[PDB]
PDB file of all heavy atoms in Angstrom:
ATOM      1  N   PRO A   1     112.831  98.332  78.722  1.00 32.18           N
ATOM      2  CA  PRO A   1     113.066  97.845  80.070  1.00 32.18           C
ATOM      3  C   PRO A   1     112.876  98.940  81.127  1.00 32.18           C
ATOM      4  O   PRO A   1     113.038 100.118  80.817  1.00 32.18           O
ATOM      5  CB  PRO A   1     114.519  97.361  80.036  1.00 32.18           C
ATOM      6  CG  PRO A   1     115.128  98.009  78.853  1.00 32.18           C
ATOM      7  CD  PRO A   1     114.039  98.228  77.879  1.00 32.18           C
ATOM      8  N   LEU A   2     112.467  98.530  82.311  1.00 32.33           N
ATOM      9  CA  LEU A   2     112.013  99.430  83.347  1.00 32.33           C
ATOM     10  C   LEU A   2     113.067 100.492  83.613  1.00 32.33           C
ATOM     11  O   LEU A   2     112.715 101.676  83.779  1.00 32.33           O
ATOM     12  CB  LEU A   2     111.682  98.683  84.638  1.00 32.33           C
ATOM     13  CG  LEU A   2     111.229  99.551  85.811  1.00 32.33           C
ATOM     14  CD1 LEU A   2     109.908 100.255  85.522  1.00 32.33           C
ATOM     15  CD2 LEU A   2     111.149  98.742  87.118  1.00 32.33           C
ATOM     16  N   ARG A   3     114.325 100.078  83.672  1.00 33.51           N
ATOM     17  CA  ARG A   3     115.402 101.012  83.929  1.00 33.51           C
ATOM     18  C   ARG A   3     115.405 102.225  82.967  1.00 33.51           C
ATOM     19  O   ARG A   3     115.744 103.329  83.388  1.00 33.51           O
ATOM     20  CB  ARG A   3     116.767 100.318  83.928  1.00 33.51           C
ATOM     21  CG  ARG A   3     117.264  99.936  82.577  1.00 33.51           C
ATOM     22  CD  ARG A   3     118.500  99.066  82.681  1.00 33.51           C
ATOM     23  NE  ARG A   3     118.903  98.918  81.298  1.00 33.51           N
ATOM     24  CZ  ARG A   3     118.876  97.870  80.514  1.00 33.51           C
ATOM     25  NH1 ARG A   3     118.560  96.681  80.958  1.00 33.51           N
ATOM     26  NH2 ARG A   3     119.241  98.027  79.270  1.00 33.51           N
ATOM     27  N   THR A   4     115.024 101.994  81.698  1.00 32.92           N
ATOM     28  CA  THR A   4     114.940 103.065  80.714  1.00 32.92           C
ATOM     29  C   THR A   4     113.691 103.922  80.849  1.00 32.92           C
ATOM     30  O   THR A   4     113.753 105.141  80.672  1.00 32.92           O
ATOM     31  CB  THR A   4     115.093 102.488  79.311  1.00 32.92           C
ATOM     32  OG1 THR A   4     116.346 101.799  79.290  1.00 32.92           O
ATOM     33  CG2 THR A   4     115.086 103.582  78.234  1.00 32.92           C
ATOM     34  N   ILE A   5     112.579 103.314  81.210  1.00 29.22           N
ATOM     35  CA  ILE A   5     111.377 104.069  81.561  1.00 29.22           C
ATOM     36  C   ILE A   5     111.715 105.003  82.766  1.00 29.22           C
ATOM     37  O   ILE A   5     111.332 106.149  82.800  1.00 29.22           O
ATOM     38  CB  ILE A   5     110.217 103.133  81.911  1.00 29.22           C
ATOM     39  CG1 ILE A   5     109.710 102.421  80.671  1.00 29.22           C
ATOM     40  CG2 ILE A   5     109.077 103.941  82.557  1.00 29.22           C
ATOM     41  CD1 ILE A   5     108.582 101.429  80.881  1.00 29.22           C
ATOM     42  N   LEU A   6     112.463 104.476  83.731  1.00 30.64           N
ATOM     43  CA  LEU A   6     112.839 105.237  84.895  1.00 30.64           C
ATOM     44  C   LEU A   6     113.819 106.371  84.523  1.00 30.64           C
ATOM     45  O   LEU A   6     113.687 107.500  85.038  1.00 30.64           O
ATOM     46  CB  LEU A   6     113.411 104.295  85.956  1.00 30.64           C
ATOM     47  CG  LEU A   6     112.398 103.276  86.552  1.00 30.64           C
ATOM     48  CD1 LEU A   6     113.125 102.189  87.334  1.00 30.64           C
ATOM     49  CD2 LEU A   6     111.373 103.945  87.439  1.00 30.64           C
ATOM     50  N   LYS A   7     114.790 106.065  83.671  1.00 31.88           N
ATOM     51  CA  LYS A   7     115.723 107.058  83.193  1.00 31.88           C
ATOM     52  C   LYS A   7     114.992 108.220  82.525  1.00 31.88           C
ATOM     53  O   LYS A   7     115.294 109.382  82.773  1.00 31.88           O
ATOM     54  CB  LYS A   7     116.723 106.432  82.222  1.00 31.88           C
ATOM     55  CG  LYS A   7     117.756 107.419  81.680  1.00 31.88           C
ATOM     56  CD  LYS A   7     118.850 107.718  82.699  1.00 31.88           C
ATOM     57  CE  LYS A   7     119.826 108.744  82.135  1.00 31.88           C
ATOM     58  NZ  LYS A   7     121.132 108.841  82.837  1.00 31.88           N
ATOM     59  N   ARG A   8     113.994 107.877  81.705  1.00 30.38           N
ATOM     60  CA  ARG A   8     113.168 108.891  81.055  1.00 30.38           C
ATOM     61  C   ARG A   8     112.377 109.747  82.077  1.00 30.38           C
ATOM     62  O   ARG A   8     112.390 110.992  81.993  1.00 30.38           O
ATOM     63  CB  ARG A   8     112.209 108.220  80.065  1.00 30.38           C
ATOM     64  CG  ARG A   8     111.291 109.137  79.297  1.00 30.38           C
ATOM     65  CD  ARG A   8     112.042 110.162  78.529  1.00 30.38           C
ATOM     66  NE  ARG A   8     111.203 110.760  77.495  1.00 30.38           N
ATOM     67  CZ  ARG A   8     111.581 111.765  76.689  1.00 30.38           C
ATOM     68  NH1 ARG A   8     112.766 112.379  76.829  1.00 30.38           N
ATOM     69  NH2 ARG A   8     110.716 112.221  75.782  1.00 30.38           N
ATOM     70  N   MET A   9     111.732 109.079  83.043  1.00 28.83           N
ATOM     71  CA  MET A   9     110.990 109.757  84.073  1.00 28.83           C
ATOM     72  C   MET A   9     111.855 110.726  84.866  1.00 28.83           C
ATOM     73  O   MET A   9     111.472 111.863  85.122  1.00 28.83           O
ATOM     74  CB  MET A   9     110.404 108.718  85.041  1.00 28.83           C
ATOM     75  CG  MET A   9     109.784 109.274  86.319  1.00 28.83           C
ATOM     76  SD  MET A   9     109.266 107.930  87.400  1.00 28.83           S
ATOM     77  CE  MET A   9     110.869 107.484  88.132  1.00 28.83           C
ATOM     78  N   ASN A  10     113.007 110.242  85.318  1.00 29.51           N
ATOM     79  CA  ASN A  10     113.928 111.019  86.120  1.00 29.51           C
ATOM     80  C   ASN A  10     114.571 112.165  85.353  1.00 29.51           C
ATOM     81  O   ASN A  10     114.859 113.220  85.922  1.00 29.51           O
ATOM     82  CB  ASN A  10     114.951 110.057  86.797  1.00 29.51           C
ATOM     83  CG  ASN A  10     114.312 109.258  87.907  1.00 29.51           C
ATOM     84  OD1 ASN A  10     113.485 109.788  88.674  1.00 29.51           O
ATOM     85  ND2 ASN A  10     114.672 107.991  88.035  1.00 29.51           N
ATOM     86  N   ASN A  11     114.860 111.953  84.078  1.00 30.18           N
ATOM     87  CA  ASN A  11     115.374 113.024  83.213  1.00 30.18           C
ATOM     88  C   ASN A  11     114.393 114.185  83.149  1.00 30.18           C
ATOM     89  O   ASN A  11     114.783 115.355  83.312  1.00 30.18           O
ATOM     90  CB  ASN A  11     115.628 112.490  81.783  1.00 30.18           C
ATOM     91  CG  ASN A  11     116.961 111.745  81.625  1.00 30.18           C
ATOM     92  OD1 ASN A  11     117.855 111.794  82.497  1.00 30.18           O
ATOM     93  ND2 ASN A  11     117.117 111.074  80.501  1.00 30.18           N
ATOM     94  N   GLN A  12     113.151 113.860  82.843  1.00 30.02           N
ATOM     95  CA  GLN A  12     112.121 114.835  82.628  1.00 30.02           C
ATOM     96  C   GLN A  12     111.529 115.360  83.961  1.00 30.02           C
ATOM     97  O   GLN A  12     110.903 116.446  83.958  1.00 30.02           O
ATOM     98  CB  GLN A  12     110.929 114.232  81.825  1.00 30.02           C
ATOM     99  CG  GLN A  12     111.237 113.798  80.417  1.00 30.02           C
ATOM    100  CD  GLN A  12     110.008 113.361  79.686  1.00 30.02           C
ATOM    101  OE1 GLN A  12     109.207 112.548  80.197  1.00 30.02           O
ATOM    102  NE2 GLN A  12     109.825 113.872  78.491  1.00 30.02           N
ATOM    103  N   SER A  13     111.656 114.584  85.037  1.00 32.07           N
ATOM    104  CA  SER A  13     110.825 114.748  86.210  1.00 32.07           C
ATOM    105  C   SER A  13     109.348 114.470  85.869  1.00 32.07           C
ATOM    106  O   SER A  13     108.462 115.248  86.254  1.00 32.07           O
ATOM    107  CB  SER A  13     111.031 116.132  86.874  1.00 32.07           C
ATOM    108  OG  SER A  13     110.932 115.981  88.258  1.00 32.07           O
ATOM    109  N   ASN A  14     109.099 113.360  85.173  1.00 32.76           N
ATOM    110  CA  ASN A  14     107.777 113.051  84.668  1.00 32.76           C
ATOM    111  C   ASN A  14     106.792 112.575  85.746  1.00 32.76           C
ATOM    112  O   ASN A  14     106.859 111.439  86.194  1.00 32.76           O
ATOM    113  CB  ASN A  14     107.867 112.030  83.558  1.00 32.76           C
ATOM    114  CG  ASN A  14     106.592 111.948  82.754  1.00 32.76           C
ATOM    115  OD1 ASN A  14     105.502 111.738  83.316  1.00 32.76           O
ATOM    116  ND2 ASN A  14     106.690 112.150  81.438  1.00 32.76           N
ATOM    117  N   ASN A  15     105.859 113.459  86.129  1.00 31.92           N
ATOM    118  CA  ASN A  15     104.859 113.149  87.127  1.00 31.92           C
ATOM    119  C   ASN A  15     103.906 112.023  86.717  1.00 31.92           C
ATOM    120  O   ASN A  15     103.496 111.226  87.559  1.00 31.92           O
ATOM    121  CB  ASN A  15     104.005 114.401  87.494  1.00 31.92           C
ATOM    122  CG  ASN A  15     104.803 115.518  88.152  1.00 31.92           C
ATOM    123  OD1 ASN A  15     105.936 115.329  88.569  1.00 31.92           O
ATOM    124  ND2 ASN A  15     104.192 116.669  88.275  1.00 31.92           N
ATOM    125  N   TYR A  16     103.479 112.028  85.453  1.00 31.15           N
ATOM    126  CA  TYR A  16     102.582 110.990  84.963  1.00 31.15           C
ATOM    127  C   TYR A  16     103.160 109.593  85.196  1.00 31.15           C
ATOM    128  O   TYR A  16     102.478 108.704  85.713  1.00 31.15           O
ATOM    129  CB  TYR A  16     102.234 111.209  83.459  1.00 31.15           C
ATOM    130  CG  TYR A  16     101.364 110.102  82.905  1.00 31.15           C
ATOM    131  CD1 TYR A  16      99.970 110.132  83.074  1.00 31.15           C
ATOM    132  CD2 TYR A  16     101.933 108.980  82.263  1.00 31.15           C
ATOM    133  CE1 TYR A  16      99.163 109.096  82.584  1.00 31.15           C
ATOM    134  CE2 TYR A  16     101.146 107.938  81.791  1.00 31.15           C
ATOM    135  CZ  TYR A  16      99.755 107.991  81.943  1.00 31.15           C
ATOM    136  OH  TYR A  16      98.965 106.962  81.455  1.00 31.15           O
ATOM    137  N   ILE A  17     104.416 109.415  84.780  1.00 33.14           N
ATOM    138  CA  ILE A  17     105.065 108.117  84.868  1.00 33.14           C
ATOM    139  C   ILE A  17     105.254 107.745  86.343  1.00 33.14           C
ATOM    140  O   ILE A  17     104.900 106.609  86.752  1.00 33.14           O
ATOM    141  CB  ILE A  17     106.423 108.064  84.147  1.00 33.14           C
ATOM    142  CG1 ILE A  17     106.257 108.345  82.651  1.00 33.14           C
ATOM    143  CG2 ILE A  17     107.080 106.699  84.355  1.00 33.14           C
ATOM    144  CD1 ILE A  17     107.546 108.655  81.883  1.00 33.14           C
ATOM    145  N   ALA A  18     105.779 108.687  87.137  1.00 35.30           N
ATOM    146  CA  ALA A  18     106.032 108.428  88.603  1.00 35.30           C
ATOM    147  C   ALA A  18     104.736 108.120  89.382  1.00 35.30           C
ATOM    148  O   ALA A  18     104.697 107.190  90.155  1.00 35.30           O
ATOM    149  CB  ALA A  18     106.747 109.606  89.249  1.00 35.30           C
ATOM    150  N   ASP A  19     103.672 108.890  89.121  1.00 32.51           N
ATOM    151  CA  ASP A  19     102.431 108.708  89.849  1.00 32.51           C
ATOM    152  C   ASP A  19     101.754 107.412  89.513  1.00 32.51           C
ATOM    153  O   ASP A  19     101.139 106.810  90.369  1.00 32.51           O
ATOM    154  CB  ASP A  19     101.475 109.889  89.618  1.00 32.51           C
ATOM    155  CG  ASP A  19     101.966 111.195  90.302  1.00 32.51           C
ATOM    156  OD1 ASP A  19     102.603 111.110  91.378  1.00 32.51           O
ATOM    157  OD2 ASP A  19     101.621 112.257  89.787  1.00 32.51           O
ATOM    158  N   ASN A  20     101.809 107.011  88.245  1.00 31.63           N
ATOM    159  CA  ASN A  20     101.209 105.749  87.796  1.00 31.63           C
ATOM    160  C   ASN A  20     102.000 104.539  88.261  1.00 31.63           C
ATOM    161  O   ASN A  20     101.402 103.491  88.567  1.00 31.63           O
ATOM    162  CB  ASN A  20     100.980 105.753  86.267  1.00 31.63           C
ATOM    163  CG  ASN A  20      99.665 106.409  85.869  1.00 31.63           C
ATOM    164  OD1 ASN A  20      98.612 105.781  85.992  1.00 31.63           O
ATOM    165  ND2 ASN A  20      99.714 107.645  85.424  1.00 31.63           N
ATOM    166  N   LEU A  21     103.336 104.654  88.324  1.00 35.44           N
ATOM    167  CA  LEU A  21     104.164 103.590  88.954  1.00 35.44           C
ATOM    168  C   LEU A  21     103.698 103.368  90.386  1.00 35.44           C
ATOM    169  O   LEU A  21     103.449 102.221  90.786  1.00 35.44           O
ATOM    170  CB  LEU A  21     105.656 103.921  88.936  1.00 35.44           C
ATOM    171  CG  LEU A  21     106.324 103.615  87.602  1.00 35.44           C
ATOM    172  CD1 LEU A  21     107.701 104.256  87.512  1.00 35.44           C
ATOM    173  CD2 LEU A  21     106.395 102.127  87.354  1.00 35.44           C
ATOM    174  N   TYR A  22     103.545 104.476  91.136  1.00 38.76           N
ATOM    175  CA  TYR A  22     103.113 104.429  92.528  1.00 38.76           C
ATOM    176  C   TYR A  22     101.774 103.668  92.678  1.00 38.76           C
ATOM    177  O   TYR A  22     101.671 102.740  93.492  1.00 38.76           O
ATOM    178  CB  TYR A  22     103.043 105.865  93.062  1.00 38.76           C
ATOM    179  CG  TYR A  22     102.724 106.079  94.528  1.00 38.76           C
ATOM    180  CD1 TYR A  22     103.724 106.128  95.471  1.00 38.76           C
ATOM    181  CD2 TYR A  22     101.414 106.320  94.953  1.00 38.76           C
ATOM    182  CE1 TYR A  22     103.432 106.373  96.806  1.00 38.76           C
ATOM    183  CE2 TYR A  22     101.122 106.575  96.293  1.00 38.76           C
ATOM    184  CZ  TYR A  22     102.133 106.592  97.217  1.00 38.76           C
ATOM    185  OH  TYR A  22     101.866 106.819  98.546  1.00 38.76           O
ATOM    186  N   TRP A  23     100.778 104.015  91.865  1.00 43.08           N
ATOM    187  CA  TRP A  23      99.477 103.296  91.884  1.00 43.08           C
ATOM    188  C   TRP A  23      99.638 101.852  91.448  1.00 43.08           C
ATOM    189  O   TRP A  23      99.107 100.975  92.106  1.00 43.08           O
ATOM    190  CB  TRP A  23      98.355 103.977  91.046  1.00 43.08           C
ATOM    191  CG  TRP A  23      98.091 105.359  91.478  1.00 43.08           C
ATOM    192  CD1 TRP A  23      98.047 105.819  92.752  1.00 43.08           C
ATOM    193  CD2 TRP A  23      97.874 106.470  90.656  1.00 43.08           C
ATOM    194  NE1 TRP A  23      97.825 107.145  92.773  1.00 43.08           N
ATOM    195  CE2 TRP A  23      97.703 107.580  91.492  1.00 43.08           C
ATOM    196  CE3 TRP A  23      97.783 106.641  89.269  1.00 43.08           C
ATOM    197  CZ2 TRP A  23      97.446 108.867  91.000  1.00 43.08           C
ATOM    198  CZ3 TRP A  23      97.522 107.925  88.779  1.00 43.08           C
ATOM    199  CH2 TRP A  23      97.367 109.018  89.642  1.00 43.08           C
ATOM    200  N   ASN A  24     100.396 101.619  90.380  1.00 41.01           N
ATOM    201  CA  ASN A  24     100.664 100.270  89.870  1.00 41.01           C
ATOM    202  C   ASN A  24     101.317  99.387  90.888  1.00 41.01           C
ATOM    203  O   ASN A  24     101.016  98.197  90.927  1.00 41.01           O
ATOM    204  CB  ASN A  24     101.586 100.291  88.648  1.00 41.01           C
ATOM    205  CG  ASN A  24     100.893 100.783  87.400  1.00 41.01           C
ATOM    206  OD1 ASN A  24      99.706 101.018  87.386  1.00 41.01           O
ATOM    207  ND2 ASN A  24     101.668 100.953  86.328  1.00 41.01           N
ATOM    208  N   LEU A  25     102.198  99.958  91.717  1.00 40.79           N
ATOM    209  CA  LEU A  25     102.860  99.177  92.768  1.00 40.79           C
ATOM    210  C   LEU A  25     101.983  98.916  94.004  1.00 40.79           C
ATOM    211  O   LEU A  25     102.428  98.207  94.926  1.00 40.79           O
ATOM    212  CB  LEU A  25     104.209  99.806  93.163  1.00 40.79           C
ATOM    213  CG  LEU A  25     105.211  99.791  92.003  1.00 40.79           C
ATOM    214  CD1 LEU A  25     106.344 100.815  92.194  1.00 40.79           C
ATOM    215  CD2 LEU A  25     105.781  98.398  91.738  1.00 40.79           C
ATOM    216  N   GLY A  26     100.793  99.517  94.054  1.00 39.57           N
ATOM    217  CA  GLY A  26      99.894  99.322  95.177  1.00 39.57           C
ATOM    218  C   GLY A  26      99.527 100.547  95.956  1.00 39.57           C
ATOM    219  O   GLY A  26      98.782 100.460  96.923  1.00 39.57           O
ATOM    220  N   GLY A  27     100.027 101.713  95.569  1.00 40.06           N
ATOM    221  CA  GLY A  27      99.673 102.960  96.277  1.00 40.06           C
ATOM    222  C   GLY A  27     100.247 103.041  97.670  1.00 40.06           C
ATOM    223  O   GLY A  27     101.208 102.336  98.025  1.00 40.06           O
ATOM    224  N   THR A  28      99.644 103.900  98.470  1.00 39.89           N
ATOM    225  CA  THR A  28     100.188 104.288  99.757  1.00 39.89           C
ATOM    226  C   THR A  28     100.364 103.124 100.746  1.00 39.89           C
ATOM    227  O   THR A  28     101.407 103.017 101.429  1.00 39.89           O
ATOM    228  CB  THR A  28      99.378 105.433 100.341  1.00 39.89           C
ATOM    229  OG1 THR A  28      99.385 106.485  99.361  1.00 39.89           O
ATOM    230  CG2 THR A  28     100.015 105.964 101.620  1.00 39.89           C
ATOM    231  N   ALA A  29      99.395 102.234 100.833  1.00 41.87           N
ATOM    232  CA  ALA A  29      99.536 101.110 101.778  1.00 41.87           C
ATOM    233  C   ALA A  29     100.726 100.244 101.417  1.00 41.87           C
ATOM    234  O   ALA A  29     101.576  99.951 102.246  1.00 41.87           O
ATOM    235  CB  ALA A  29      98.252 100.310 101.845  1.00 41.87           C
ATOM    236  N   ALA A  30     100.824  99.886 100.146  1.00 39.58           N
ATOM    237  CA  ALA A  30     101.935  99.101  99.669  1.00 39.58           C
ATOM    238  C   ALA A  30     103.256  99.887  99.864  1.00 39.58           C
ATOM    239  O   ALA A  30     104.259  99.274 100.240  1.00 39.58           O
ATOM    240  CB  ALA A  30     101.733  98.673  98.221  1.00 39.58           C
ATOM    241  N   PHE A  31     103.245 101.199  99.643  1.00 44.63           N
ATOM    242  CA  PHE A  31     104.434 102.013  99.865  1.00 44.63           C
ATOM    243  C   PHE A  31     104.986 101.977 101.285  1.00 44.63           C
ATOM    244  O   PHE A  31     106.189 101.829 101.505  1.00 44.63           O
ATOM    245  CB  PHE A  31     104.205 103.464  99.513  1.00 44.63           C
ATOM    246  CG  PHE A  31     105.447 104.312  99.715  1.00 44.63           C
ATOM    247  CD1 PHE A  31     106.383 104.408  98.749  1.00 44.63           C
ATOM    248  CD2 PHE A  31     105.660 104.990 100.919  1.00 44.63           C
ATOM    249  CE1 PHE A  31     107.519 105.157  98.965  1.00 44.63           C
ATOM    250  CE2 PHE A  31     106.784 105.743 101.121  1.00 44.63           C
ATOM    251  CZ  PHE A  31     107.710 105.816 100.154  1.00 44.63           C
ATOM    252  N   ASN A  32     104.093 102.085 102.262  1.00 45.99           N
ATOM    253  CA  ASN A  32     104.504 102.072 103.666  1.00 45.99           C
ATOM    254  C   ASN A  32     105.169 100.762 104.061  1.00 45.99           C
ATOM    255  O   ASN A  32     106.168 100.768 104.773  1.00 45.99           O
ATOM    256  CB  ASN A  32     103.321 102.443 104.562  1.00 45.99           C
ATOM    257  CG  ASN A  32     102.938 103.907 104.425  1.00 45.99           C
ATOM    258  OD1 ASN A  32     103.634 104.694 103.816  1.00 45.99           O
ATOM    259  ND2 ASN A  32     101.754 104.239 104.869  1.00 45.99           N
ATOM    260  N   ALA A  33     104.650  99.627 103.583  1.00 47.19           N
ATOM    261  CA  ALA A  33     105.291  98.313 103.848  1.00 47.19           C
ATOM    262  C   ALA A  33     106.693  98.275 103.242  1.00 47.19           C
ATOM    263  O   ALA A  33     107.639  97.738 103.836  1.00 47.19           O
ATOM    264  CB  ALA A  33     104.428  97.167 103.318  1.00 47.19           C
ATOM    265  N   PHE A  34     106.807  98.800 102.035  1.00 47.31           N
ATOM    266  CA  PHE A  34     108.112  98.914 101.355  1.00 47.31           C
ATOM    267  C   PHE A  34     109.084  99.762 102.178  1.00 47.31           C
ATOM    268  O   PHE A  34     110.222  99.354 102.359  1.00 47.31           O
ATOM    269  CB  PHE A  34     107.978  99.466  99.940  1.00 47.31           C
ATOM    270  CG  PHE A  34     109.222 100.131  99.433  1.00 47.31           C
ATOM    271  CD1 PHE A  34     110.306  99.400  99.011  1.00 47.31           C
ATOM    272  CD2 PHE A  34     109.302 101.524  99.393  1.00 47.31           C
ATOM    273  CE1 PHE A  34     111.436 100.036  98.539  1.00 47.31           C
ATOM    274  CE2 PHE A  34     110.454 102.152  98.952  1.00 47.31           C
ATOM    275  CZ  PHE A  34     111.518 101.408  98.518  1.00 47.31           C
ATOM    276  N   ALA A  35     108.615 100.900 102.681  1.00 46.65           N
ATOM    277  CA  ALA A  35     109.466 101.799 103.445  1.00 46.65           C
ATOM    278  C   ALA A  35     109.938 101.179 104.778  1.00 46.65           C
ATOM    279  O   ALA A  35     111.091 101.345 105.174  1.00 46.65           O
ATOM    280  CB  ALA A  35     108.767 103.113 103.706  1.00 46.65           C
ATOM    281  N   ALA A  36     109.046 100.442 105.437  1.00 45.08           N
ATOM    282  CA  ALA A  36     109.383  99.728 106.666  1.00 45.08           C
ATOM    283  C   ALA A  36     110.441  98.649 106.397  1.00 45.08           C
ATOM    284  O   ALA A  36     111.414  98.523 107.140  1.00 45.08           O
ATOM    285  CB  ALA A  36     108.127  99.109 107.272  1.00 45.08           C
ATOM    286  N   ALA A  37     110.257  97.847 105.351  1.00 44.89           N
ATOM    287  CA  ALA A  37     111.116  96.688 105.153  1.00 44.89           C
ATOM    288  C   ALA A  37     112.446  97.093 104.533  1.00 44.89           C
ATOM    289  O   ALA A  37     113.496  96.656 104.954  1.00 44.89           O
ATOM    290  CB  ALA A  37     110.385  95.633 104.313  1.00 44.89           C
ATOM    291  N   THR A  38     112.396  97.888 103.485  1.00 41.78           N
ATOM    292  CA  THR A  38     113.612  98.243 102.727  1.00 41.78           C
ATOM    293  C   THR A  38     114.345  99.432 103.342  1.00 41.78           C
ATOM    294  O   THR A  38     115.540  99.386 103.441  1.00 41.78           O
ATOM    295  CB  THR A  38     113.278  98.562 101.251  1.00 41.78           C
ATOM    296  OG1 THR A  38     112.561  97.468 100.669  1.00 41.78           O
ATOM    297  CG2 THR A  38     114.543  98.838 100.434  1.00 41.78           C
ATOM    298  N   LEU A  39     113.635 100.484 103.726  1.00 41.58           N
ATOM    299  CA  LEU A  39     114.267 101.695 104.230  1.00 41.58           C
ATOM    300  C   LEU A  39     114.326 101.780 105.760  1.00 41.58           C
ATOM    301  O   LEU A  39     114.862 102.745 106.304  1.00 41.58           O
ATOM    302  CB  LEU A  39     113.569 102.914 103.654  1.00 41.58           C
ATOM    303  CG  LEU A  39     113.624 103.066 102.141  1.00 41.58           C
ATOM    304  CD1 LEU A  39     112.799 104.264 101.711  1.00 41.58           C
ATOM    305  CD2 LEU A  39     115.051 103.225 101.638  1.00 41.58           C
ATOM    306  N   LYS A  40     113.803 100.769 106.451  1.00 44.54           N
ATOM    307  CA  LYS A  40     113.715 100.780 107.906  1.00 44.54           C
ATOM    308  C   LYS A  40     113.102 102.082 108.393  1.00 44.54           C
ATOM    309  O   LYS A  40     113.574 102.684 109.344  1.00 44.54           O
ATOM    310  CB  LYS A  40     115.085 100.553 108.541  1.00 44.54           C
ATOM    311  CG  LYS A  40     115.787  99.266 108.137  1.00 44.54           C
ATOM    312  CD  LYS A  40     114.835  98.060 108.156  1.00 44.54           C
ATOM    313  CE  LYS A  40     115.531  96.722 108.353  1.00 44.54           C
ATOM    314  NZ  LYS A  40     115.610  95.965 107.078  1.00 44.54           N
ATOM    315  N   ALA A  41     111.980 102.455 107.793  1.00 43.15           N
ATOM    316  CA  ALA A  41     111.404 103.779 107.945  1.00 43.15           C
ATOM    317  C   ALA A  41     109.897 103.738 108.113  1.00 43.15           C
ATOM    318  O   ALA A  41     109.203 103.004 107.393  1.00 43.15           O
ATOM    319  CB  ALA A  41     111.746 104.589 106.735  1.00 43.15           C
TER     320      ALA A  41
END
């Protein structure tokens, strides 16, 4: 489950896992929409 993949990434500081999540979620454009809506940023 995702929470455990995340636990592993965060434990290690795993760049591979974090960077691929970012691309998988839509990359920078998708990130900015997320930051505006969720983080008011």
Side-chain angles (χ1 to χ4, degrees):
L2 178 64
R3 74 189 186 249
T4 303
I5 290 178
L6 294 166
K7 180 77 182 197
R8 181 57 163 176
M9 170 184 79
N10 287 320
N11 279 347
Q12 296 186 311
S13 216
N14 195 306
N15 296 347
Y16 177 84
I17 299 166
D19 290 328
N20 275 282
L21 279 166
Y22 185 90
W23 302 320
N24 286 354
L25 296 160
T28 304
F31 181 85
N32 290 350
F34 156 76
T38 306
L39 298 176
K40 302 315 204 256

